[PDB]
Design a protein around this ligand. Structure first.
Ligand SMILES: Nc1ncnc2c1ncn2[C@@H]1O[C@H](COP(=O)(O)OP(=O)(O)NP(=O)(O)O)[C@@H](O)[C@H]1O
Ligand SMILES: Nc1ncnc2c1ncn2[C@@H]1O[C@H](COP(=O)(O)OP(=O)(O)NP(=O)(O)O)[C@@H](O)[C@H]1O
Ligand SMILES: O=C(NOC[C@H](O)CO)c1ccc(F)c(F)c1Nc1ccc(I)cc1F
Ligand SMILES: [Mg+2]
Ligand SMILES: [Mg+2]
Lengths: 277, 302
């Protein structure tokens, strides 16, 4: 019914909580001291206690993870109604902030390398049997060539959808969802029961690949309802309007494939990215 | 109308009774997120809508400049505007308080809205959209019953139209539900104009006439009694299936043809504002004596 912090392999003596790092839909993220650390405080309503113990096993699954491209899960303590997820602190800035910085060059070579790093980390998480379910630029950190993935698996326990008969969509969420998921969205759909898969994570990386070169999300102009219908019927943009070659556009065509089985695995995707000019 | 000019000018005699607006001027009266508020530097009772944005000052300055043009637009068919200020992470839009509310909650109060009232509603909505396009080169972009307001004076006015392009982008999250009034061409991502607003009006009119959101259409049993669907299923139904239509028994031919011309899928074939202006339905409705204020106060309770 509870998880303690002495259960963890990281030797834990004291934990200092500092300033808030930023606003977020899921919990609060504070600075911490252990070395510096990142603390995410979550609250549980003391209901769906079977979904609660499933959260415990998903956390114990995080324990067996260690990879250079994956944020270091360091601990998690649970004293209901309060939960806390403690991960290593990422220096630098999020890929979302880097891609939207005019003072930073993103040539084709660096974008190929950044993509390959995310693929390596996502391949590790898939090999360990872990779905990210919320891969995006705000959950990737880049510090002068160091690329780390963040916030994998939180979406299952998240509750970011919570009006009457009206589902909340934030701007960048829809364009990362594969068509099989987009067709499922409903005003009373919940994150725990959405058909996520390894193919859906590959679709989300395809969105990041578009974002790396266009320096903006796809469907930037259009409202949410138009995005839902267009992505559901399988309409997708390309990168030729900015003058990108076929090699860089084939990446999208494979990752954004309408049928799940046509999307490559991350190992195959790593092969494809190695062969770019 | 001569009368409409008077109340418009009387609205501008209330315009300078305040100069600037900030938070401490207002006391929360009630909830209608929009709030009925009592202003104290001036005796006006106002409607204050607050939009939550966490964003840097420079773009908000751009937002306020774009919102100040509402001081310029004035019409008996669009609701009046007092001012727009920023305070504590929410930007405020101050407008007239209309004691009748929106058409969606008065339809919730009544059973169904009769044809004669909907005729006057059509005339005012058409002239309101015509005013915005011809005088200010803006389209509404969000026509639906929840943003058409009424009052005990008997005037009906449009609100919540897209005047600021940056405010559309600055909103962090949208709320997508089971009722959609978006035109088929907008859902498919093609070029659109006020023709989309005309579709939205037509779909709003049939919903208010029958008392139910008309997509998907009701079966035979539900149509007699009157007298679980995913979001993508509804949107694809709007795009691919034939548009909704009024029952042929209870409504006049002029009204049925009016909404049919508004709900043509091809926006080039859909009637424009001028064609509507001369459609036999609103020529007939314009020359009719209906006490709109009496229908409102008697059925709602004011
Ligand atoms: N490991 C980390 N190191 C440093 N900052 C972090 C870390 N994880 C999250 N943050 C920051 O904490 C804030 C909140 O994060 P988070 O709750 O994940 O929201 P987000 O992913 O950035 N956007 P969203 O999930 O759509 O609400 C953001 O400013 C993040 O950049
Ligand atoms: N100016 C107003 N005068 C009187 N009632 C109003 C006014 N503006 C809004 N309302 C009422 O308050 C409600 C809030 O409207 P609004 O904030 O636009 O949300 P909504 O119309 O319900 N749906 P949406 O506009 O898509 O968020 C409306 O449905 C009306 O019932
Ligand atoms: O209320 C608005 N709703 O738009 C919703 C978005 O289109 C979709 O989320 C809106 C949008 C743009 C803008 F510039 C405004 F001033 C708006 N509000 C608004 C406009 C005119 C009056 I008189 C009173 C008002 F309160
Ligand atoms: Mg996150
Ligand atoms: Mg509104």
């Amino acid at each position: 019914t509870s998880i303690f912090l002495q259960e963890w392999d990281i030797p834990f003596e004291q934990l200092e909580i500092g300033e808030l790092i930023g606003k977020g839909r899921f919990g609060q993220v504070y600075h911490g001291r252990w070395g510096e650390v990142a603390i995410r405080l979550i609250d549980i309503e003391r209901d769906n206690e079977d979904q609660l113990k499933a959260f415990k096993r998903e956390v114990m699954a995080y324990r067996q993870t260690r990879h250079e491209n994956v944020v270091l899960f360091m601990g998690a303590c649970m004293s209901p109604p309060h939960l806390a997820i403690i991960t290593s602190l990422c220096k630098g800035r999020t890929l979302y902030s880097v891609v939207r910085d005019a003072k930073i060059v993103l040539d084709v070579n660096k974008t190929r390398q950044i993509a390959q790093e995310i693929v390596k980390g996502m391949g590790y998480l898939h090999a360990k049997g872990i779905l990210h379910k919320d891969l995006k630029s705000k959950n990737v950190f880049y510090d002068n060539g160091k690329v780390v993935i963040t916030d994998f698996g939180l979406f299952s326990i998240s509750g970011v959808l919570q009006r009457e008969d009206k589902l909340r969509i934030q701007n960048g969420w829809l364009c990362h969802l594969a068509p099989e998921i987009i067709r499922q969205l409903s005003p009373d759909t919940e994150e725990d029961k959405l058909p996520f898969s390894k193919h859906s994570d590959v679709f989300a990386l395809g969105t990041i690949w578009y974002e790396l070169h266009a320096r903006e999300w796809p469907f930037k102009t259009q409202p949410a309802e138009a995005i839902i219908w267009q992505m559901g019927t399988g309409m997708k943009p390309n990168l030729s309007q900015i003058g990108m070659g076929k090699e860089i556009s084939d990446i999208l065509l494979f990752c954004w494939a309408f049928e799940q089985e046509e999307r490559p695995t991350f190992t195959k995707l790593m092969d494809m990215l190695e062969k770019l000019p | 109308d001569e009368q409409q000019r008077k109340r418009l000018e009387a609205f501008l005699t209330q315009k300078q009774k305040v100069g600037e607006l900030k938070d401490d001027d207002f006391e929360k009266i009630s909830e209608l997120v929009v709030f009925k508020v009592s202003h104290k530097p001036s005796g006006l009772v106002m409607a204050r809508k607050l939009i939550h944005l966490e964003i840097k000052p420079a773009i908000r300055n751009q937002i306020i400049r774009e919102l100040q043009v509402l001081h310029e637009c004035n019409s008996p068919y669009i609701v009046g505007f007092y001012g727009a200020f920023y305070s504590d992470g929410e930007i405020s839009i101050c407008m007239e308080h209309m004691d009748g509310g929106s058409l969606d909650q008065v339809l919730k109060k009544a059973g169904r809205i009769p044809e004669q009232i909907l005729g006057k509603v059509s005339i005012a909505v058409i002239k309101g959209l015509t005013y915005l396009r011809e005088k200010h080169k803006i389209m509404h972009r969000d026509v639906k019953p929840s943003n058409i307001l009424v009052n005990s004076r008997g005037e009906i006015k449009l609100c919540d139209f897209g005047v600021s392009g940056q405010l559309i982008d600055s909103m962090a999250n949208s709320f997508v539900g089971t009722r959609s009034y978006m035109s088929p061409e907008r859902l498919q991502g093609t070029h659109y104009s006020v023709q989309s607003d005309i579709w939205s009006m037509g779909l709003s009119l049939v919903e208010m006439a029958v008392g139910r959101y008309p997509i998907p259409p009701p079966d035979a049993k539900e149509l007699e009694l009157m007298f679980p669907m995913a979001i993508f299923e509804l949107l694809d139904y709007i795009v691919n299936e034939p548009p909704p239509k009024l029952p042929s028994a209870v409504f006049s031919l002029e009204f049925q043809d009016f909404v049919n011309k508004c709900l043509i899928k091809n926006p080039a074939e859909r009637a424009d504002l001028k064609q509507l202006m001369v459609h036999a339905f609103i020529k007939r409705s314009d020359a009719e004596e209906v006490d709109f204020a009496g229908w409102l106060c008697s059925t709602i309770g004011l």
